[PDB]
PDB file of C-alpha atoms and ligand atoms in Angstrom:
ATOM      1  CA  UNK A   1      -6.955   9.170 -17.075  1.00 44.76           C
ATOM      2  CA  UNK A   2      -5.581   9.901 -13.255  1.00 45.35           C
ATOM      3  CA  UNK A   3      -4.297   7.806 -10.693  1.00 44.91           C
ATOM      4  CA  UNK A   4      -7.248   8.803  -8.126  1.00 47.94           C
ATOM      5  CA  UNK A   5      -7.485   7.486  -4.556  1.00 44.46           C
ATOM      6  CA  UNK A   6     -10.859   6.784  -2.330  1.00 44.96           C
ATOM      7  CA  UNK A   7     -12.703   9.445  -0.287  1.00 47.13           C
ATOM      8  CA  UNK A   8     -10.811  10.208   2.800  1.00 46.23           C
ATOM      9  CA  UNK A   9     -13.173  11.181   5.122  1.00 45.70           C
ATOM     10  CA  UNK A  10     -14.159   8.348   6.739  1.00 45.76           C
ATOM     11  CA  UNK A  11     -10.322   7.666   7.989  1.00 45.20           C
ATOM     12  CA  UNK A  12      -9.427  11.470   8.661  1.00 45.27           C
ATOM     13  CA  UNK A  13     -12.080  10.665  11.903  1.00 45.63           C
ATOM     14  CA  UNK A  14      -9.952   7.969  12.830  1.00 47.95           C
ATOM     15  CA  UNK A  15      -6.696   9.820  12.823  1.00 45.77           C
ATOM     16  CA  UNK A  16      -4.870  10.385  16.575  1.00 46.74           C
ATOM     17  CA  UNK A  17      -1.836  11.636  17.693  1.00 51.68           C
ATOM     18  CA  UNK A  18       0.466   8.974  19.826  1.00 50.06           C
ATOM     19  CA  UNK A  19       3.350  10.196  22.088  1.00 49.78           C
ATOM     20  CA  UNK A  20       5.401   7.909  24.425  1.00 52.62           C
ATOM     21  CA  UNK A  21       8.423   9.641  25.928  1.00 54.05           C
ATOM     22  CA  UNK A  22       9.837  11.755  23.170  1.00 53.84           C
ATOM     23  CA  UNK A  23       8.943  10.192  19.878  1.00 54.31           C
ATOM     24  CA  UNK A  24       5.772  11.026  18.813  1.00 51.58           C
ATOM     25  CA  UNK A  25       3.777   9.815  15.609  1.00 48.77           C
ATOM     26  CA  UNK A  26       0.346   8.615  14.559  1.00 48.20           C
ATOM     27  CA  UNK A  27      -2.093   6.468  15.351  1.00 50.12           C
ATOM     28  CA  UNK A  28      -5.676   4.720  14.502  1.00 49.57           C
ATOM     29  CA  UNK A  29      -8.526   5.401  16.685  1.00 47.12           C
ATOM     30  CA  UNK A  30     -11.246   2.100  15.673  1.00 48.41           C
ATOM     31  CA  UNK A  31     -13.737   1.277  18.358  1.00 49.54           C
ATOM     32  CA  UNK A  32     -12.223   2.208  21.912  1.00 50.01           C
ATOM     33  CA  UNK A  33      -8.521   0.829  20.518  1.00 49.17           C
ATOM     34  CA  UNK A  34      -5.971   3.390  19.321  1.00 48.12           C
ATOM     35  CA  UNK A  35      -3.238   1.384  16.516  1.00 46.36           C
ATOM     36  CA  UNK A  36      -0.137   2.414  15.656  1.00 48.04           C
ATOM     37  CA  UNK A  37       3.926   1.260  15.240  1.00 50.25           C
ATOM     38  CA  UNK A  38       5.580  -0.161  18.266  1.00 48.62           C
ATOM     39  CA  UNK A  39       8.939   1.664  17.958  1.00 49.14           C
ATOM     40  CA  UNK A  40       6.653   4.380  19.456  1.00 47.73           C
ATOM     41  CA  UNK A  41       8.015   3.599  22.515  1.00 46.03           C
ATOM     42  CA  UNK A  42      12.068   3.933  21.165  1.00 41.80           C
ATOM     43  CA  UNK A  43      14.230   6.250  21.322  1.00 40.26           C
ATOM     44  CA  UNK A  44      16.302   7.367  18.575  1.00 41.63           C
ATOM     45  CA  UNK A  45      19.032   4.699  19.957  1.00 43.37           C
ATOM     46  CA  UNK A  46      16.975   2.627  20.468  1.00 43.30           C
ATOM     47  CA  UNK A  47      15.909   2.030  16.776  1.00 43.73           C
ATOM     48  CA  UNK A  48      19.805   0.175  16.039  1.00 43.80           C
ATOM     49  CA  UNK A  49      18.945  -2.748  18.273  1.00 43.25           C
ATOM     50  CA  UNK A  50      15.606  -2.714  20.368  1.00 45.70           C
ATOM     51  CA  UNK A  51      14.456  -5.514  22.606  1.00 47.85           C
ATOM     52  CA  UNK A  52      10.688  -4.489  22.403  1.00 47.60           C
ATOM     53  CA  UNK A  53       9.151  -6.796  24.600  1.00 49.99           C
ATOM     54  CA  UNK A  54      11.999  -5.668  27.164  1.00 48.78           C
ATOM     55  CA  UNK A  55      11.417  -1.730  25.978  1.00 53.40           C
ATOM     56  CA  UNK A  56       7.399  -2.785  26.555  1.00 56.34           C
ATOM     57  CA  UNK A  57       8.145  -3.134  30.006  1.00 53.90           C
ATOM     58  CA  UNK A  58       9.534  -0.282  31.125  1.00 54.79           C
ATOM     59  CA  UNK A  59       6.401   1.358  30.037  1.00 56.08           C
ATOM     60  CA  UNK A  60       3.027   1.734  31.672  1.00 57.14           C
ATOM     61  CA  UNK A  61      -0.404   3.135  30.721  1.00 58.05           C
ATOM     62  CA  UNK A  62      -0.022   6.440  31.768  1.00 59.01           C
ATOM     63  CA  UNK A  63       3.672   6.856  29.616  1.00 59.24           C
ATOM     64  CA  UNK A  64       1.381   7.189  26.291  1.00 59.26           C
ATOM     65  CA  UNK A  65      -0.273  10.433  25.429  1.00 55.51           C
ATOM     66  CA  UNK A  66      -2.544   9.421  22.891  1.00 59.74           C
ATOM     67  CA  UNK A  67      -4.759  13.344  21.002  1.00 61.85           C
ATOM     68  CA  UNK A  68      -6.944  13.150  18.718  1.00 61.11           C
ATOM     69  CA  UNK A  69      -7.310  16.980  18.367  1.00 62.08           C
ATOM     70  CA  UNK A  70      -8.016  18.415  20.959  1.00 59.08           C
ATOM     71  CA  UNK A  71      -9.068  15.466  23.315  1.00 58.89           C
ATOM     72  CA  UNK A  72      -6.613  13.639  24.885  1.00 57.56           C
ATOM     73  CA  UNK A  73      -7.431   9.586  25.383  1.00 59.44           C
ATOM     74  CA  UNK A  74      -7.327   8.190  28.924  1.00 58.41           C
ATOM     75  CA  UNK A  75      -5.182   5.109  28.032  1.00 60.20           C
ATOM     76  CA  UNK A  76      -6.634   1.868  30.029  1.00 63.22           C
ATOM     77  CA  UNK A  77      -4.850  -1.018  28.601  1.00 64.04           C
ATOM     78  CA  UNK A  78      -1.313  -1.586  26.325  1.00 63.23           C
ATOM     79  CA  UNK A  79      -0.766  -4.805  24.011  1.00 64.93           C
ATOM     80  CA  UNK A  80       2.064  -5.768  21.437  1.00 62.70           C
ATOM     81  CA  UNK A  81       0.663  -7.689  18.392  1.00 61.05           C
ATOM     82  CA  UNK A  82       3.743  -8.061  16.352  1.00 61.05           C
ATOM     83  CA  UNK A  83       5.009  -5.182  15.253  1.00 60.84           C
ATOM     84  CA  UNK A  84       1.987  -3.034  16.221  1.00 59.45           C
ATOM     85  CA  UNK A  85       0.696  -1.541  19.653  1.00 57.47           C
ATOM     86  CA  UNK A  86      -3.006  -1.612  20.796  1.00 56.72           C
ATOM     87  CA  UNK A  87      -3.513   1.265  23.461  1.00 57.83           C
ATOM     88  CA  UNK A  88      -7.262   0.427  25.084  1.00 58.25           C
ATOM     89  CA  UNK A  89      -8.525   3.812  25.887  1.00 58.97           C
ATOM     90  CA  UNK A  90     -12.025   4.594  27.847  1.00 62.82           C
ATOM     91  CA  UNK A  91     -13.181   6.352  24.654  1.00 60.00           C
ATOM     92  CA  UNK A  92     -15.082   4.450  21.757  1.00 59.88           C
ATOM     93  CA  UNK A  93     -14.578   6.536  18.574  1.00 57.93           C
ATOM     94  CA  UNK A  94     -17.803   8.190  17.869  1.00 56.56           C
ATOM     95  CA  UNK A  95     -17.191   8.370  14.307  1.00 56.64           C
ATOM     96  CA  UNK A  96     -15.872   4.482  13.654  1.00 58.29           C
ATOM     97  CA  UNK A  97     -16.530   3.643  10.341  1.00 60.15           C
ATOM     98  CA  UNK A  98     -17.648   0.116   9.073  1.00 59.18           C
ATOM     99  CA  UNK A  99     -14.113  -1.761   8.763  1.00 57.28           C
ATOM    100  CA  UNK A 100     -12.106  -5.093   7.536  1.00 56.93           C
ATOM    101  CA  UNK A 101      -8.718  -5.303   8.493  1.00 58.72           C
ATOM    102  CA  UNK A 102      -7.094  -7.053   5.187  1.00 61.96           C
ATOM    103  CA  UNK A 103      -3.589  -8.306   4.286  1.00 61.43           C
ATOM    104  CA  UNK A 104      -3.655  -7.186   0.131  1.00 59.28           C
ATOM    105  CA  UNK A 105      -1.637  -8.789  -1.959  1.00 58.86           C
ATOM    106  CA  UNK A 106       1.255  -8.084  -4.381  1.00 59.11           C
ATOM    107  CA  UNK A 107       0.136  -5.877  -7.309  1.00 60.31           C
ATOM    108  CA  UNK A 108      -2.872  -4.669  -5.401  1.00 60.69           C
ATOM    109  CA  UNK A 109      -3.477  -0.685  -5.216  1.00 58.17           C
ATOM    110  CA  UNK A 110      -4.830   1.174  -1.736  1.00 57.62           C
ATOM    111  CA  UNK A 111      -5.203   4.531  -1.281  1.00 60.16           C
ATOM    112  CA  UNK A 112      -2.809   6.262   1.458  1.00 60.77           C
ATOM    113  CA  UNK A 113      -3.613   9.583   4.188  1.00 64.03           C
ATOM    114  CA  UNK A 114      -0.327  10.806   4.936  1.00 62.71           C
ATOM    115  CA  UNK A 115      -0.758  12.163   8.294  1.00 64.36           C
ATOM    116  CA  UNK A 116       2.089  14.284  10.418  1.00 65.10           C
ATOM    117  CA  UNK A 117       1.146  14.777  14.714  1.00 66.49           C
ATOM    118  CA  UNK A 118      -2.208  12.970  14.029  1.00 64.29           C
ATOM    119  CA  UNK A 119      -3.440  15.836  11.614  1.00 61.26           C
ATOM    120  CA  UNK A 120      -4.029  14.617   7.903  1.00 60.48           C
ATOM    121  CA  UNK A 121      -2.418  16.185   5.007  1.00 58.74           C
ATOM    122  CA  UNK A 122      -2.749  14.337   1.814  1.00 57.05           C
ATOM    123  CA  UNK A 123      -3.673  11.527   0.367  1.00 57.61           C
ATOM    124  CA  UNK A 124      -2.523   9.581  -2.570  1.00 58.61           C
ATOM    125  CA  UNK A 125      -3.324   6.235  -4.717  1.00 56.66           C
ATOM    126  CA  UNK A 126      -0.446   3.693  -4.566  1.00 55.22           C
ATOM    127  CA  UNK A 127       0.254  -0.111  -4.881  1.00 53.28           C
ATOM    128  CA  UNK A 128       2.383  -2.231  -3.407  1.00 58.41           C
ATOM    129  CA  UNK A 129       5.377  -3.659  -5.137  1.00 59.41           C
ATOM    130  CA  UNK A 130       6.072  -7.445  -5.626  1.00 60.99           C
ATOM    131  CA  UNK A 131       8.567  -7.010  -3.338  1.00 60.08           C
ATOM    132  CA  UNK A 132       6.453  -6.108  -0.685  1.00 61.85           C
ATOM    133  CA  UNK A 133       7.704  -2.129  -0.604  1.00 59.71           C
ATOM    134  CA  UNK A 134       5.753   0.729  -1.393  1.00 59.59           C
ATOM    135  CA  UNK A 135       7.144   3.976  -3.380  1.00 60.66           C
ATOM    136  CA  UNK A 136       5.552   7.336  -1.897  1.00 60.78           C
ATOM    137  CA  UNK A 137       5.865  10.905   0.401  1.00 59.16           C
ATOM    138  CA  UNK A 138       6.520   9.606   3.912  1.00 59.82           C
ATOM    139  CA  UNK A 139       8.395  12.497   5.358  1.00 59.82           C
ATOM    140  CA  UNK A 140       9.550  12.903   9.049  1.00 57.29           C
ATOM    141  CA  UNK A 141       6.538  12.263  11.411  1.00 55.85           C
ATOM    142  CA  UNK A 142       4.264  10.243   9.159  1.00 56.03           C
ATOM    143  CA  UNK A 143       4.371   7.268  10.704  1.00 58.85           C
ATOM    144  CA  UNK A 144       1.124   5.278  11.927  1.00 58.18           C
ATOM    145  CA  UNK A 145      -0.074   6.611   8.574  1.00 57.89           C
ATOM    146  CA  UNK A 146      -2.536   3.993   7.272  1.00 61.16           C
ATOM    147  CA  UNK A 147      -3.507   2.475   3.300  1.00 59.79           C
ATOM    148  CA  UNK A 148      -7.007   1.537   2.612  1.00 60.04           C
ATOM    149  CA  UNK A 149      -9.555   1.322  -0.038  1.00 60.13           C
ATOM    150  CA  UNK A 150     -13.284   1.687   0.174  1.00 58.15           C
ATOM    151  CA  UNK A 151     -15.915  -0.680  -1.242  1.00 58.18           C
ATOM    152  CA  UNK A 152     -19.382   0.925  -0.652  1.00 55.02           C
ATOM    153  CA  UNK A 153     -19.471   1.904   3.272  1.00 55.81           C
ATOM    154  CA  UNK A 154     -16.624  -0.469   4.173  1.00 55.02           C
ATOM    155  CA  UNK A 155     -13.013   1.099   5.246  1.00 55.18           C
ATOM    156  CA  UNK A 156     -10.558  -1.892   4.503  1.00 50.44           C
ATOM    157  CA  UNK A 157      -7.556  -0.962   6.336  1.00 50.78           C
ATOM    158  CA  UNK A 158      -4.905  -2.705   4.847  1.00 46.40           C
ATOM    159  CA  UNK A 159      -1.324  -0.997   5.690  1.00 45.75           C
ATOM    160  CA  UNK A 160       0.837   1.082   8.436  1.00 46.60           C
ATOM    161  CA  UNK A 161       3.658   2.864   7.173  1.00 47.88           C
ATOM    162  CA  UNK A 162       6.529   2.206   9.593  1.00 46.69           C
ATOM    163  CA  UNK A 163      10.149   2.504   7.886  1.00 42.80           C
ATOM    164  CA  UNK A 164      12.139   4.187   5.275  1.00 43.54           C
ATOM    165  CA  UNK A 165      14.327   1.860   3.967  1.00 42.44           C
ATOM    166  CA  UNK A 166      17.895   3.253   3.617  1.00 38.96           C
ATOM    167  CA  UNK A 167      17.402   2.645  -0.203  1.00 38.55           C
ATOM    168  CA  UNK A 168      14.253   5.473  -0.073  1.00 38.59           C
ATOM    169  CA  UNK A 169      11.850   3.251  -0.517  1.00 39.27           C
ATOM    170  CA  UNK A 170       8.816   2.422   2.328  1.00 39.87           C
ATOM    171  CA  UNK A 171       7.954  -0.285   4.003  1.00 40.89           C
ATOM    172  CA  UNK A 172       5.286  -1.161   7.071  1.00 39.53           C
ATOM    173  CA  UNK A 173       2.591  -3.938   8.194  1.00 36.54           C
ATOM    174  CA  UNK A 174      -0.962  -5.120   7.856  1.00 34.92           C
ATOM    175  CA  UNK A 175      -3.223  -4.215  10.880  1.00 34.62           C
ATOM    176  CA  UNK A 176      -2.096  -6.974  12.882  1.00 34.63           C
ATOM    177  CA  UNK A 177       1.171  -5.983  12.444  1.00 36.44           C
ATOM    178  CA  UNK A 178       3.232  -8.216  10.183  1.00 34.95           C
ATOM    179  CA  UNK A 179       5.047  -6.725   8.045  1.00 35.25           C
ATOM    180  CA  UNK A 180       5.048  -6.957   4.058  1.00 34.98           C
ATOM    181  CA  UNK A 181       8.139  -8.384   3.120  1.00 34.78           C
ATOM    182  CA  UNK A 182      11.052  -9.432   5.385  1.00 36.53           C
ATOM    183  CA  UNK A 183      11.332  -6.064   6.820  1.00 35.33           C
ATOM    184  CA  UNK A 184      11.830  -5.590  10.409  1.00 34.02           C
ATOM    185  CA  UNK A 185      11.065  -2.336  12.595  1.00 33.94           C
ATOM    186  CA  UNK A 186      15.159  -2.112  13.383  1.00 36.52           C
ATOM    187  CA  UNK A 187      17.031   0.919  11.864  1.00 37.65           C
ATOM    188  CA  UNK A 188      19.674  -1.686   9.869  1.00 39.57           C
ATOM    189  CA  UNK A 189      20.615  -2.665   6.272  1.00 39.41           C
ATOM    190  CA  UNK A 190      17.396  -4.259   5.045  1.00 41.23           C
ATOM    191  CA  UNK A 191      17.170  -5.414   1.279  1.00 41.80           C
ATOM    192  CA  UNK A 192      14.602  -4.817  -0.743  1.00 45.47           C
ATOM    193  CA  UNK A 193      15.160  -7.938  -2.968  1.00 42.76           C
ATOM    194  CA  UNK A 194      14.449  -7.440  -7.476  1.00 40.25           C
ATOM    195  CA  UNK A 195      11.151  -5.884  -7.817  1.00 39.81           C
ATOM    196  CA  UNK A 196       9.157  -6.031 -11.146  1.00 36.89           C
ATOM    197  CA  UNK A 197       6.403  -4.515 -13.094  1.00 33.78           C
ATOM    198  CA  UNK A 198       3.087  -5.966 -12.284  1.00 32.28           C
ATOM    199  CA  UNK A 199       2.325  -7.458 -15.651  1.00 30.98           C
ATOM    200  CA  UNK A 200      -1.670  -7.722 -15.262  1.00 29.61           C
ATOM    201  CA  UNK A 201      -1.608  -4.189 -13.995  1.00 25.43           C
ATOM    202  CA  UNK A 202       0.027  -2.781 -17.523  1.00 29.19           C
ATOM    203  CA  UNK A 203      -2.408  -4.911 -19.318  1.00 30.44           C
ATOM    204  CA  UNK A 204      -5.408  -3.458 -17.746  1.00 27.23           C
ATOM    205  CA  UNK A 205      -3.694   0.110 -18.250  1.00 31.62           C
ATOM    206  CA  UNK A 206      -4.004  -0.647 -21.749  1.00 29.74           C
ATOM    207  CA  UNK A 207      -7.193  -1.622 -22.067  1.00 30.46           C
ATOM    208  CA  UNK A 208      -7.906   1.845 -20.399  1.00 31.96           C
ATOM    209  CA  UNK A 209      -5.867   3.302 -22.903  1.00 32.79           C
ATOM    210  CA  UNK A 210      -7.911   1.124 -25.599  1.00 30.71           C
ATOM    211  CA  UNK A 211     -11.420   2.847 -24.272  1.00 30.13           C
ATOM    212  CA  UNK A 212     -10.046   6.576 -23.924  1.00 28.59           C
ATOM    213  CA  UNK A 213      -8.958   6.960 -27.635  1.00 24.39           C
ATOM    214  CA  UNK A 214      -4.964   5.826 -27.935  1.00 24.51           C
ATOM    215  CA  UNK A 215      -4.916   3.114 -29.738  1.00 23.20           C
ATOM    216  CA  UNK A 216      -1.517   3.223 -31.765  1.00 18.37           C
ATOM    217  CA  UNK A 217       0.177   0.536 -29.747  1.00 16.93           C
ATOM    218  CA  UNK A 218      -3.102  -1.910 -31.125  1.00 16.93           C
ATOM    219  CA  UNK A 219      -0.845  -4.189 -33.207  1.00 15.87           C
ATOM    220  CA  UNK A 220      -1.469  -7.262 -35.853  1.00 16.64           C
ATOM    221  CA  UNK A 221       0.327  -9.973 -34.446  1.00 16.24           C
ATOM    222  CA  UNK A 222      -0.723 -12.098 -31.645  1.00 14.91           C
ATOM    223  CA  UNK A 223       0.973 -14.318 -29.652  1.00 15.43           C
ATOM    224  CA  UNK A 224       1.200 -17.542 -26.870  1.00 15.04           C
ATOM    225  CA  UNK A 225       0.885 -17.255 -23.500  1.00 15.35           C
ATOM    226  CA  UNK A 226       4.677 -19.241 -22.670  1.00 15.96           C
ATOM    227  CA  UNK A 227       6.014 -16.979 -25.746  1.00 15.12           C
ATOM    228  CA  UNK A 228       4.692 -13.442 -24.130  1.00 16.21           C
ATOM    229  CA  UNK A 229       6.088 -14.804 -20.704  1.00 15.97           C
ATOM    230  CA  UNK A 230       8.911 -15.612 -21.905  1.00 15.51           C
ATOM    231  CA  UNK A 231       9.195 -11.775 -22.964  1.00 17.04           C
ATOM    232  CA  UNK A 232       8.347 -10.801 -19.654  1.00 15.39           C
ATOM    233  CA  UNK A 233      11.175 -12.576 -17.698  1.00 12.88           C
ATOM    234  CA  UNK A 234      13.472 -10.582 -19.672  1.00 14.65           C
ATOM    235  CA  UNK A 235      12.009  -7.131 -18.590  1.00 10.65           C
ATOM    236  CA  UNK A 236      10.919  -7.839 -15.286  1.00 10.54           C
ATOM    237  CA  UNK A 237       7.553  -8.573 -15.730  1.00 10.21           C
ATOM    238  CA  UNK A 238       5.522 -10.915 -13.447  1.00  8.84           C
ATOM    239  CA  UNK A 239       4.653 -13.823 -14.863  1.00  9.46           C
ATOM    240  CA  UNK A 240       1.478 -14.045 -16.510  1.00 11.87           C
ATOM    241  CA  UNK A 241      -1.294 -16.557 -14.698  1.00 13.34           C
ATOM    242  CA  UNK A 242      -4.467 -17.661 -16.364  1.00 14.22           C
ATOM    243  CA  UNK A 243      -6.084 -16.124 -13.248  1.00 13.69           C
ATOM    244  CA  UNK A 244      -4.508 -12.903 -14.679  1.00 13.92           C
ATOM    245  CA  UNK A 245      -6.133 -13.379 -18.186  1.00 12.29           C
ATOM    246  CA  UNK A 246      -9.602 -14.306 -16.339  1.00 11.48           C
ATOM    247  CA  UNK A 247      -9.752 -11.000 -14.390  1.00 10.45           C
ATOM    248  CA  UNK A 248      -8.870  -9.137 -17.698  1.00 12.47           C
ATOM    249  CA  UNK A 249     -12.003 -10.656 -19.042  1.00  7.36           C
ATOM    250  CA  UNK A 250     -14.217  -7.830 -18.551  1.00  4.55           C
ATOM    251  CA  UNK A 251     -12.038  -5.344 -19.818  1.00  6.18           C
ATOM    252  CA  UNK A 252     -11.413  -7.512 -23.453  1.00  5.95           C
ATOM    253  CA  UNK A 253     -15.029  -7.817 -23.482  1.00  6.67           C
ATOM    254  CA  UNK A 254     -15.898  -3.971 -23.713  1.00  9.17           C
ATOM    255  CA  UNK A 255     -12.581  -3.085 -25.987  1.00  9.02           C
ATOM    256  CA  UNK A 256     -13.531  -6.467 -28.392  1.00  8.21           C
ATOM    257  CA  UNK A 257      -9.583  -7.193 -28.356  1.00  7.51           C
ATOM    258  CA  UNK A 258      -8.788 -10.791 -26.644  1.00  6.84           C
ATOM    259  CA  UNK A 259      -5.790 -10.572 -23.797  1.00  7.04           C
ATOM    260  CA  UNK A 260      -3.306 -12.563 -25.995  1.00  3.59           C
ATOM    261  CA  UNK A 261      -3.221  -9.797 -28.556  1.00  2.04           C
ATOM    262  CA  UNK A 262      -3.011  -7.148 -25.838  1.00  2.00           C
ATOM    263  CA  UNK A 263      -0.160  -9.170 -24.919  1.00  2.00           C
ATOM    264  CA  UNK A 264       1.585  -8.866 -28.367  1.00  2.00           C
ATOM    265  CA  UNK A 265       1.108  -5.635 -28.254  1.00  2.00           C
ATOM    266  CA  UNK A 266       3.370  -5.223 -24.982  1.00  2.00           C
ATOM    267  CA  UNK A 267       5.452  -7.848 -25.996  1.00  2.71           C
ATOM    268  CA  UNK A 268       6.300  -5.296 -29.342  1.00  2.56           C
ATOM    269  CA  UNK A 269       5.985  -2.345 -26.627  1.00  4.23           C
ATOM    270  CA  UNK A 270       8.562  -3.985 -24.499  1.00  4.95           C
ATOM    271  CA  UNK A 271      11.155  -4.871 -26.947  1.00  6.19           C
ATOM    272  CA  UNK A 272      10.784  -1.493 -29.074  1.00  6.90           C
ATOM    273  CA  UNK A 273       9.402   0.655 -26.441  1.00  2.70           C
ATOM    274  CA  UNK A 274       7.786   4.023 -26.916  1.00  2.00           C
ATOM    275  CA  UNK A 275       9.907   5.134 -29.753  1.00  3.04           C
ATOM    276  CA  UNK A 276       8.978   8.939 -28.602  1.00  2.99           C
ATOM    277  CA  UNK A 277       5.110   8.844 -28.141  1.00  3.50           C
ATOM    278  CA  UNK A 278       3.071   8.275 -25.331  1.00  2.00           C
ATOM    279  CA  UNK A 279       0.121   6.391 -24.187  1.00  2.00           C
ATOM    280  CA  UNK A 280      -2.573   8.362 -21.870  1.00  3.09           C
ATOM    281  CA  UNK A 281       0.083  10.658 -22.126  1.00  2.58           C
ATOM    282  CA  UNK A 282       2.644   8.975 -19.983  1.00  2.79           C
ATOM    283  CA  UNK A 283       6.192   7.742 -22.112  1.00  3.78           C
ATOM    284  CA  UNK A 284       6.445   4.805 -19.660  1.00  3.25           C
ATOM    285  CA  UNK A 285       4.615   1.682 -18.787  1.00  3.11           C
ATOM    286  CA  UNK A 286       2.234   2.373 -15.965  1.00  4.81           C
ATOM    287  CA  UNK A 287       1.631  -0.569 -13.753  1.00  4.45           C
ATOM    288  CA  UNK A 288      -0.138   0.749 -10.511  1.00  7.23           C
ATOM    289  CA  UNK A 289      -3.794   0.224 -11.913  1.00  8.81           C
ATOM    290  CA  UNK A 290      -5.308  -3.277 -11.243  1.00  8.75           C
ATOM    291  CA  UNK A 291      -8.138  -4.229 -13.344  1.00  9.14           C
ATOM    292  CA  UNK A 292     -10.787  -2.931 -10.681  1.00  7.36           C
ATOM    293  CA  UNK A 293      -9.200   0.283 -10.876  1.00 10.61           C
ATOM    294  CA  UNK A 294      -9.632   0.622 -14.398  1.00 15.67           C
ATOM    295  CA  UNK A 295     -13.117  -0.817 -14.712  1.00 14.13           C
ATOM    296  CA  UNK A 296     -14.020   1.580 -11.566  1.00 13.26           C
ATOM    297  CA  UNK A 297     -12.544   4.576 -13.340  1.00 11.89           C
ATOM    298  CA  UNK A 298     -14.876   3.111 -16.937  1.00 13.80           C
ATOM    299  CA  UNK A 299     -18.494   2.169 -16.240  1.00 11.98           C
TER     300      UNK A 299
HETATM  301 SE1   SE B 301       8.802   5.900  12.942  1.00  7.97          SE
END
């Protein structure tokens, strides 16, 4: 059982290198609009204390060199939308996929194409954190880098990577450019704030765990719902919602094992842990699977 992101292809095509005085990083080529981070246009000192609608103005339409490849873009128009920048270019994308643009929630999973001067080079499955940040490989020169997922033909963009946070974790915006979290694109002490493990996530890792064999964590007790959140609380573990028991429906359907006694199992797995084994072969709790995911990654 793998972590296993979407099909890239459809957003490699969309992939463009941005360059406005010295920084350069990337950018989203949808339609005849090119998206990617405002502090674009920043210098390195800038980045402590920018004034963006003042920095905005300095610039014109020529200052941005926006590639994709081997083409450059003639740039016809510049807008700031929050924390993003729309360059209008001549130039619809030929290859323009069929797209949402989508603020996700907490807990949900996207797949991400790290790309470095426009040009992809990997792509991984993620989720982001209740506390709005994101864990993953952003290394110099992958900003503009974009999360998605797929459903059937349909690209649902859904994040921009923009800043490391000096704690090493990631953080960045929705399409329109509001961030996730109460980051700001200013190179300053930002916290993070107590993230947790996303409790309906784990669940739905075990029932994946349930329907590929390991079933040694299956227990005999049950328990309430206020008595297995009142576990959780302890060990950092979002609060179970009915909601969260109603999307697990499927899954305790095919396994035969209701959610509460999935939840005495974690509640035991919690306060005993994995005592030396491991389940689908990870000796931790893995909580970057929603219940789509799984069910996907089933039948
Ligand atoms: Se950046």
């Amino acid at each position: 059982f793998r972590k296993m992101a979407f099909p890239s292809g459809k957003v490699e095509g969309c992939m463009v290198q941005v360059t406005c005085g010295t920084t350069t990083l990337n950018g989203l080529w949808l339609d005849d609009v090119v998206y990617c981070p405002r502090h674009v246009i920043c210098t390195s000192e800038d980045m402590l204390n920018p004034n963006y609608e003042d920095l905005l103005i300095r610039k014109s339409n020529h200052n941005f060199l926006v590639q994709a490849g081997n083409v450059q873009l003639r740039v016809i128009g510049h807008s700031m939308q929050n924390c993003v920048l729309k360059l209008k270019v001549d130039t619809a994308n030929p290859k323009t996929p069929k797209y949402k643009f989508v603020r996700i929630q907490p807990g949900q999973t996207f797949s991400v194409l790290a790309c470095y001067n426009g040009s992809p080079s990997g792509v991984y499955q993620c989720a982001m954190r209740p506390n709005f940040t994101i864990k993953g490989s952003f290394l110099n020169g992958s900003c503009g880098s974009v999360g998605f997922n797929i459903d059937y033909d349909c690209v649902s963009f859904c994040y921009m990577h923009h800043m490391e946070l000096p704690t090493g974790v990631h953080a960045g915006t929705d399409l329109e450019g509001n961030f996730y979290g109460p980051f700001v694109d200013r190179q300053t002490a930002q916290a993070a704030g107590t993230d947790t493990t996303i409790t309906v996530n784990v669940l739905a890792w075990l029932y994946a765990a349930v329907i590929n064999g390991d079933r040694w964590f299956l227990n005999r007790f049950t328990t309430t719902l206020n008595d297995f959140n009142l576990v959780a609380m302890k060990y950092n573990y979002e609060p179970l919602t009915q909601d969260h028991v109603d999307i697990l429906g499927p899954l305790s359907a095919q396994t035969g094992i209701a959610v509460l006694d999935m939840c005495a199992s974690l509640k035991e797995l919690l306060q005993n842990g994995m005592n030396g084994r491991t389940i689908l072969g990870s000796a931790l709790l893995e909580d970057e699977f929603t219940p789509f995911d799984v069910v996907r990654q089933c039948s």
